[PDB]
Amino acid sequence: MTVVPENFVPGLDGVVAFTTEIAEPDKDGGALRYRGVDIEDLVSQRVTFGDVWALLVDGNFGSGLPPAEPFPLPIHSGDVRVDVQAGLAMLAPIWGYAPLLDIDDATARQQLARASVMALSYVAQSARGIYQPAVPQRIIDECSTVTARFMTRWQGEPDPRHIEAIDAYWVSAAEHGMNASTFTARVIASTGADVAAALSGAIGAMSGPLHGGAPARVLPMLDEVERAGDARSVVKGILDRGEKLMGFGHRVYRAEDPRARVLRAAAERLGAPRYEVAVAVEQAALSELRERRPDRAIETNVEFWAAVVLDFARVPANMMPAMFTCGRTAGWCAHILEQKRLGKLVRPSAIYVGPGPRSPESVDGWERVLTTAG
Template sequence: MEKVLAIGLEGIAVAKTSLSLVDGINGLLVYRGHWARDLAVHHTFEEVAYLMWFGKLPTSEELTVFQTSLANERALPEHVTQIIDATPLDRDMMSVLRTAVSALGCTSQSWPPTIQQVIGVTARIPTIIAHRQARIEGKAPVGPRRDLGHTANYLYMLKGDVPKAAHVRALDAYLILTQEHGMNASTFAGRVVASTQSDIYSALTASIGALKGPLHGGAPSEVTEMIEAIGTKENAESWIRNKLEKGDRLMGFGHRIYKTIDPRATALQKVASQLSADDPWFDLATHVEKVGMELLAEYKPNRKLHTNVEFFAAAVMRAVGLDDQLFTPTFALSRTVGWCAHIMEQAENNRIIRPESEYSGKMPD
């Protein structure tokens, strides 16, 4: 059989999935038969995680049991906190998260992965991030609370105070919209490891390692750098115009997959719009988005460049008080739901993923 060479596997389907549909041409994102934008507007992180793992939205009784299960698994094993504390403070957060998740698997490995493992690792990732952030700031870590939802507890552990409802709602929407996004690099990495019948912690470690790369998980912080450089509404047009005239890329606009409006950006803008009334930074970001769209239409009329999810993700995460170094780890916190769903789906009908390569070297004499 003749080999087909597809560098980067672009345009190649490697699995059938019931988890999500990503249609970049038409700007569609579907989670298990539901529009992702509607889920972000009308549901919570826990409800959508349940949908991804169990295939349906929970009843009120099922949701209560599920929320309790997550809340009960938030505390970290002592050996994991020791590893986090022993890691030099100059190491980046994603490296610490990768190592800590790997350490979670020291006492619980099995094939196929279990839903209890999935719940446990998803519940503990926010605690890992918050514990590490406290050490970076020279503070005592704030332990998790069982009476708070997943997103509210994450913000509570980071800040030490119960967060505002508007902040929880906005970040919850972001965490829903980034739970799953098809066969991206980190998801594929996790499925490859899972296909060897390795444990879920090894698969997730591979996924985190892939997301750590700046080509996959680093865009939101570049958006905040742009907005901070602009500084004021009055400066927005001149700054953006100068950038476009030099041929530079405008961060947070355009997407490799979506050739029309990113549906995640639309939903996140809708949910987060309530922040602009009392948050100057989010208000500035909204203005920059408006001016950016106008000038892109002027300078690049033949390009369909729209605001992507990273733009409003940066605006939301900065508005709720997250430092730039927390942006990619927070992305990992949400995408863990999708990674786990894919790992379980891979295990259900497993075949080892073993592509081929085309030799381009010399033949021996």
């Protein structure tokens, strides 16, 4: 802890923290796989989110996410993320969740599933809000998928097409390697904390606007083209004005992000009213950015089609981050269980480059210490 190694770079970019068996974002190959299964196969075969949760967590099919038990959300803070972050942490004492260090794998797995679906129930309740009555459990119980139950608990009578849109979205968002919120879940798990503490901390990481991957603020642009009608000219004006085009930029996969293709497809198939305009904005935005920057590689961000699909499902813009979080719980749970089996505390190091030894009296403000105390 003294000298900065030769062009050391802050952060952990490219530092391998783990091996994982859970999922492979194959950027070079243009494909995203969950336990070896392409998400395009999962989504096109209409595998529901609860079953994809189990594939990711267990490595095989057959023990899908159970329905949430009745539990009125105790937290009403004005922010769905806070409600779920606080509410999840509070499950440990009332449900008796011991630290991960103290339980076997099967128990941790059951506790993950029970807590994970309660995260969805809490989001639905928070979004529905306190200024109207809860949806009765018996109406939710008429549903046959976790995704249908979530939409019913939130909206009461959801359009089945909107349930399908959320299913496609959540599966496409379920897992994506070693990002900050997945990493936060694994660090908290690695202390042997209970699984609710790890999920609650991951929600905190996920809430940061630099976490990346939350749906795109593209709806105002899609409204402009709906009134103006000239997708190309609106794109040209968005760029000429100095503004940046939302939902487009550098390539993430080799070409098309496969999650963007899956969601564009979902929007087409389900007859989302904004589809035709969005397809026009996409073709306009890529041909425009590529013509303006011919040596740069430009593709559609999944966050663009995520906004179209979520918006179709009547998700308000202020709620789209929570919807991302709902899907990502599958990957968090898978990584928490894998971290438990790893059994290795995550505890990096630092190099000290601050002041050397000195007296307290030599520190600025010391007179104020003696004046306050005196």
